[PDB]
């Protein structure tokens, strides 16, 4: 077969017949004359003055002849150089109220322009280096930065962009990975990645195709130059209505390639950024030449940032482990350890707080911060190393490959914790469906799959985005989110039992809703039996199944006083006459459990009076806590809640337990709970959460807030030691806050882990609430 009349055909031809599509090279399937007909390069990609009105020469890469517009193969700058038109970038910003598309366009097309390793801060270089990108950013909708997923590498992040899924769910958990069920390894180099079996979820091109929206072919063989890809996208946009795709992808390997070689701050980065802008220029000039520049939505998006890293800053496992030849390490800016073909507890202990300024921390994957969502996949090794920004971890010094000079290859790298500043990347949306000259807050790249589906009129496949949380990016929204319906309604028990009926082994020395549930009652979204319990200082939703609160809500004013637990109440636990003895915890179980103590969800320390303080010792306010965790919890309750109330002008706090023994980020059922307090059916939480809300305008108190809300949340691991915190032998003021900042979380994360729905009664729109629920308080900003 021949490629004559078929260059970059959108249909693909099955074997044995030869192909002419943009991927044929990658499958060794092109017709003999593909290069000759489809990959013309003569005279480059730009018209010059001397070429204007030339006699057409079919050898040229693109054309500057009078007939080129009608034939559809002009160079992108043809009208500029030969017809006196202006570059798109030199035109004034003008609002696109409505898509201005040629007749027969059913919807505005979407072009996704992805850049690899584009740090958010590169945008500070401005129009002097990147005038086209700067115009898109200024005129369109932009965020200061976009948060990638962990690990902050290309393959996980690009496939998250495509699917809306965390890597643990889509399956591309690294650039490199081993599947023990396949007994095979996936790598950047080689053929294994072309096997469909690695790739889960439903990416945008499949979602589009299944719902009758033409995607064409996203992927390009890497040897086709950038300029040819741009020209081909433009030619596809000129196809007839029954063939023209509605969505296009362009991907650039820059500025990642340069970032690795020169570091993110090297003066050598300027040129690669200029070249990316030149390519954006060609696209926009090219669209303008087709009169599609006010028709198409363009997304300019990065996969991750780039950090300064050097050979000099490498930790070696051979300095900790006596037995490194028995382990396989996925090295670099993260660590994944498994057996060569070895004991996990030994390895973790040998890597835990062994050197004073140790530049990595080992975790069993279930103990990683829940915000990373990096555990529920067989391709994720049990042992994980979180590596400090600017550092590498390697197995042994002679595992590190060198350049001929002896020095390491990289001055830049990425892959670190996705809350690290240097890993943040970019988002700009420009076009008829995006807002005009609008800044939006930072958001996570898991949210974009939904947006792209909305931009194409597609129903998204189930994903980890919160659909509606990015409605404020768009001028017009084809998705209106609705609050989920409550599944279980509470009971409201009154006094039902006499104290004499209780023998729990306990002893003690003898406008609630309005004040303490500021944003309404959380809805329970699964089938269960629970009670609303009111008190002077706090309200709770008490589970009869788990024998403790699902949530506890209370408000602490700026002027609230902290008091001590009187010595005589130290061991006070009181039966709750509203709740059956059989639905209550018992003190005997804690006495007999050598490892387990207990804490309180509402802190006795913040009670409004000595009289009300007795409510805080109710058995229905008690939760199981390891003595090590009580050090953390007690400092949070006695010191930090009041600090936050002073800083934020009051806070509302909702605290509760989380059960996630199978580490899937979702509420466990009873069956899935694997640990109970000794001799009892009191389940042991894997984590404790808190959601701390106040007024965004801190000049207004939390309980009289007219406007937007401000939230910070955490999901603290409920651990029997503080081995995670290397300073834990010191006073809690030296390490507890650091622990908590590491385990910051979104409200949405807590919702997945609890089956609760928060903020059900506010004066805010539901899409603004959805935005609030996806917010992550990072303590870099
Ligand atoms: C983030 O969002 C995710 C998506 O909503 C949430 O994951 C989902 O979690 C639910 C609840 O536990 C799971 O429900 C069980 O599914 C079982 C059915 O098995 C399979 O069917 C799924 C549907 O497949 C059809 O539809 C999709 C459209 O999206 C198409 O892509 C398919 O072609 C097909 O038409 C399928 O999605 C699922 O896929 C996984 O498994 C394969 C291997 O077989 C992997 O290649 C792939 O990467 C997925 O793996 C992930 O999930 C599995 C659990 O299924 C994990 O073991 C694995 O470690 C990895 O995390 C599968 O083949 C059914 O028998 C049960 O009764 C449940 O109904 C969904 O399967 C699951 N979906 C996905 C994509 O993972 C996730 O909870 C959420 N996370 C948070 C924190 O909120
Ligand atoms: C990552 C890769 C592009 C970069 C590159 O390395 N180019 C190859 C040059 S070389 O190695 O031959 O020298 C793309 C190209 C085709 C894609 C594949 C597609 O064809 C077919 C599949 C489509 C599925 O929905 C996703 C998985 C799937 C297997 C794609 C995964 C990603 C694939 C492999
Ligand atoms: C809407 C989605 C956005 C557009 C593209 C989505 C495609 C997602 C699908 C699969 C992931 C890989 C797609 C191929 C792109 C190029 C892959 C590649 O070879 O990247 C260079 C890589 O060595 C750099 O790795 P890093 O060291 O992690 O930067
Ligand atoms: Ca679970
Ligand atoms: Na005990
Ligand atoms: Na410690
Ligand atoms: Zn890279």
Numbering used by the authors: 56 to 396, 402 to 570, 590 to 860
Question: How do the authors describe this structure?
Answer:
Autotaxin (ATX) is a secreted lysophospholipase D (lysoPLD) that produces the bioactive lipid lysophosphatidic acid (LPA) from extracellular lysophospholipids, predominantly lysophosphatidylcholine (LPC). Crystal structures of ATX89 (ENPP2) revealed a catalytic domain with a bimetallic active site adjacent to a catalytic threonine. Substrate binding takes place in a shallow hydrophilic groove that accommodates nucleotides as well as the glycerol moiety of lysophospholipids, and in a deep hydrophobic pocket binding the lysophospholipid acyl chain. In addition, the catalytic domain together with the first of two somatomedin-β (SMB) domains, form a tunnel adjacent to the active site.
Crucially, mathematical modelling indicated that TUDCA is a noncompetitive inhibitor, implying that LPC or LPA can co-exist in a ternary complex with ATX. In this complex, TUDCA is well defined in density and the steroid moiety lies in the tunnel, but the conjugated tail is in a single well-defined conformation pointing away from the active site. We conclude that the tunnel is an allosteric site that binds bile salts to reduce LPA production rates, most likely by slowing down product release.
